Amino acid sequence: GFSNSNSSTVAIDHSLSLAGERTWAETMGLNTADTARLNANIRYVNTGTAPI
Amino acid sequence: GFSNSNSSTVAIDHSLSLAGERTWAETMGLNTADTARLNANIRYVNTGTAPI
Incomplete structure:
Protein backbone atom coordinates (compact mmCIF):
# COMPACT_ATOMS: atom_id res chain seq x y z
CA GLY A 1 0.00 0.00 0.00
CA PHE A 2 0.96 3.59 -0.79
CA SER A 3 -0.78 6.21 1.36
CA ASN A 4 -0.44 9.96 0.91
CA SER A 15 -4.11 34.29 28.00
CA LEU A 16 -4.33 36.14 31.33
CA SER A 17 -1.90 36.16 34.29
CA LEU A 18 -2.36 37.68 37.76
CA ALA A 19 0.90 37.80 39.74
CA GLY A 20 0.80 38.98 43.35
CA GLU A 21 4.08 39.31 45.23
CA ARG A 22 5.06 40.29 48.77
CA THR A 23 8.75 40.97 49.37
CA TRP A 24 10.50 41.29 52.72
CA ALA A 25 14.05 42.63 52.89
CA GLU A 26 16.58 43.47 55.60
CA THR A 27 19.99 45.12 55.38
CA MET A 28 22.72 45.81 57.96
CA GLY A 29 25.44 48.24 56.91
CA LEU A 30 28.65 48.75 58.83
CA ASN A 31 31.95 50.60 58.50
CA THR A 32 34.95 48.83 60.02
CA ALA A 33 36.71 52.07 60.91
CA ASP A 34 33.72 53.59 62.72
CA THR A 35 32.07 50.65 64.43
CA ALA A 36 31.59 52.10 67.90
CA ARG A 37 31.16 55.39 69.73
CA LEU A 38 32.18 55.86 73.33
CA ASN A 39 30.87 57.78 76.32
CA ALA A 40 32.46 57.95 79.77
CA ASN A 41 30.76 58.68 83.08
CA ILE A 42 33.36 60.27 85.32
CA ARG A 43 33.81 62.30 88.49
CA TYR A 44 36.45 64.66 89.79
CA VAL A 45 37.99 64.10 93.22
CA ASN A 46 40.09 66.53 95.24
CA THR A 47 42.17 64.83 97.88
CA GLY A 48 44.53 67.80 98.12
CA THR A 49 44.60 70.81 100.40
CA ALA A 50 44.20 73.84 98.20
CA PRO A 51 41.23 74.28 95.86
CA ILE A 52 41.77 74.45 92.12
CA GLY B 1 -9.17 6.87 -2.39
CA PHE B 2 -9.94 10.57 -1.91
CA SER B 3 -10.46 11.66 1.72
CA ASN B 4 -11.21 15.22 2.81
CA SER B 15 -3.19 28.18 36.17
CA LEU B 16 -1.67 28.98 39.58
CA SER B 17 1.97 29.67 40.54
CA LEU B 18 3.50 30.05 44.02
CA ALA B 19 7.06 31.43 43.89
CA GLY B 20 9.03 31.68 47.14
CA GLU B 21 12.47 33.26 47.04
CA ARG B 22 15.22 33.91 49.59
CA THR B 23 18.01 36.24 48.51
CA TRP B 24 21.35 36.76 50.23
CA ALA B 25 23.58 39.66 49.23
CA GLU B 26 26.90 41.13 50.33
CA THR B 27 28.70 44.30 49.26
CA MET B 28 32.11 45.78 50.11
CA GLY B 29 32.66 49.40 49.12
CA LEU B 30 36.04 51.10 49.17
CA ASN B 31 37.63 54.40 48.16
CA THR B 32 41.22 54.15 46.94
CA ALA B 33 42.14 57.60 48.23
CA ASP B 34 40.80 57.00 51.76
CA THR B 35 41.58 53.36 52.45
CA ALA B 36 43.12 53.67 55.90
CA ARG B 37 43.11 55.86 58.99
CA LEU B 38 46.06 56.09 61.34
CA ASN B 39 46.57 56.46 65.07
CA ALA B 40 49.90 56.75 66.88
CA ASN B 41 50.67 55.86 70.49
CA ILE B 42 53.53 58.09 71.57
CA ARG B 43 55.36 59.41 74.61
CA TYR B 44 57.42 62.49 75.35
CA VAL B 45 60.90 62.15 76.83
CA ASN B 46 63.02 64.88 78.40
CA THR B 47 66.69 64.00 78.50
CA GLY B 48 67.68 67.65 78.89
CA THR B 49 68.40 69.78 81.93
CA ALA B 50 65.83 72.54 81.95
CA PRO B 51 62.09 71.84 81.92
CA ILE B 52 59.97 72.97 78.99
Whole structure:
Protein backbone atom coordinates (compact mmCIF):
# COMPACT_ATOMS: atom_id res chain seq x y z
CA GLY A 1 0.00 0.00 0.00
CA PHE A 2 0.96 3.59 -0.79
CA SER A 3 -0.78 6.21 1.36
CA ASN A 4 -0.44 9.96 0.91
CA SER A 5 -1.42 12.51 3.56
CA ASN A 6 -1.10 16.34 3.97
CA SER A 7 -2.50 18.26 6.96
CA SER A 8 -2.64 21.93 8.02
CA THR A 9 -3.44 23.00 11.60
CA VAL A 10 -4.40 26.63 12.29
CA ALA A 11 -4.53 27.70 15.94
CA ILE A 12 -4.97 30.74 18.21
CA ASP A 13 -4.60 31.40 21.96
CA HIS A 14 -5.56 34.11 24.47
CA SER A 15 -4.11 34.29 28.00
CA LEU A 16 -4.33 36.14 31.33
CA SER A 17 -1.90 36.16 34.29
CA LEU A 18 -2.36 37.68 37.76
CA ALA A 19 0.90 37.80 39.74
CA GLY A 20 0.80 38.98 43.35
CA GLU A 21 4.08 39.31 45.23
CA ARG A 22 5.06 40.29 48.77
CA THR A 23 8.75 40.97 49.37
CA TRP A 24 10.50 41.29 52.72
CA ALA A 25 14.05 42.63 52.89
CA GLU A 26 16.58 43.47 55.60
CA THR A 27 19.99 45.12 55.38
CA MET A 28 22.72 45.81 57.96
CA GLY A 29 25.44 48.24 56.91
CA LEU A 30 28.65 48.75 58.83
CA ASN A 31 31.95 50.60 58.50
CA THR A 32 34.95 48.83 60.02
CA ALA A 33 36.71 52.07 60.91
CA ASP A 34 33.72 53.59 62.72
CA THR A 35 32.07 50.65 64.43
CA ALA A 36 31.59 52.10 67.90
CA ARG A 37 31.16 55.39 69.73
CA LEU A 38 32.18 55.86 73.33
CA ASN A 39 30.87 57.78 76.32
CA ALA A 40 32.46 57.95 79.77
CA ASN A 41 30.76 58.68 83.08
CA ILE A 42 33.36 60.27 85.32
CA ARG A 43 33.81 62.30 88.49
CA TYR A 44 36.45 64.66 89.79
CA VAL A 45 37.99 64.10 93.22
CA ASN A 46 40.09 66.53 95.24
CA THR A 47 42.17 64.83 97.88
CA GLY A 48 44.53 67.80 98.12
CA THR A 49 44.60 70.81 100.40
CA ALA A 50 44.20 73.84 98.20
CA PRO A 51 41.23 74.28 95.86
CA ILE A 52 41.77 74.45 92.12
CA GLY B 1 -9.17 6.87 -2.39
CA PHE B 2 -9.94 10.57 -1.91
CA SER B 3 -10.46 11.66 1.72
CA ASN B 4 -11.21 15.22 2.81
CA SER B 5 -11.34 16.19 6.49
CA ASN B 6 -11.87 19.25 8.72
CA SER B 7 -11.42 19.58 12.50
CA SER B 8 -11.84 22.38 15.06
CA THR B 9 -10.34 22.19 18.57
CA VAL B 10 -11.57 24.61 21.25
CA ALA B 11 -9.56 24.74 24.48
CA ILE B 12 -9.23 26.64 27.78
CA ASP B 13 -6.69 26.66 30.65
CA HIS B 14 -6.47 27.96 34.22
CA SER B 15 -3.19 28.18 36.17
CA LEU B 16 -1.67 28.98 39.58
CA SER B 17 1.97 29.67 40.54
CA LEU B 18 3.50 30.05 44.02
CA ALA B 19 7.06 31.43 43.89
CA GLY B 20 9.03 31.68 47.14
CA GLU B 21 12.47 33.26 47.04
CA ARG B 22 15.22 33.91 49.59
CA THR B 23 18.01 36.24 48.51
CA TRP B 24 21.35 36.76 50.23
CA ALA B 25 23.58 39.66 49.23
CA GLU B 26 26.90 41.13 50.33
CA THR B 27 28.70 44.30 49.26
CA MET B 28 32.11 45.78 50.11
CA GLY B 29 32.66 49.40 49.12
CA LEU B 30 36.04 51.10 49.17
CA ASN B 31 37.63 54.40 48.16
CA THR B 32 41.22 54.15 46.94
CA ALA B 33 42.14 57.60 48.23
CA ASP B 34 40.80 57.00 51.76
CA THR B 35 41.58 53.36 52.45
CA ALA B 36 43.12 53.67 55.90
CA ARG B 37 43.11 55.86 58.99
CA LEU B 38 46.06 56.09 61.34
CA ASN B 39 46.57 56.46 65.07
CA ALA B 40 49.90 56.75 66.88
CA ASN B 41 50.67 55.86 70.49
CA ILE B 42 53.53 58.09 71.57
CA ARG B 43 55.36 59.41 74.61
CA TYR B 44 57.42 62.49 75.35
CA VAL B 45 60.90 62.15 76.83
CA ASN B 46 63.02 64.88 78.40
CA THR B 47 66.69 64.00 78.50
CA GLY B 48 67.68 67.65 78.89
CA THR B 49 68.40 69.78 81.93
CA ALA B 50 65.83 72.54 81.95
CA PRO B 51 62.09 71.84 81.92
CA ILE B 52 59.97 72.97 78.99
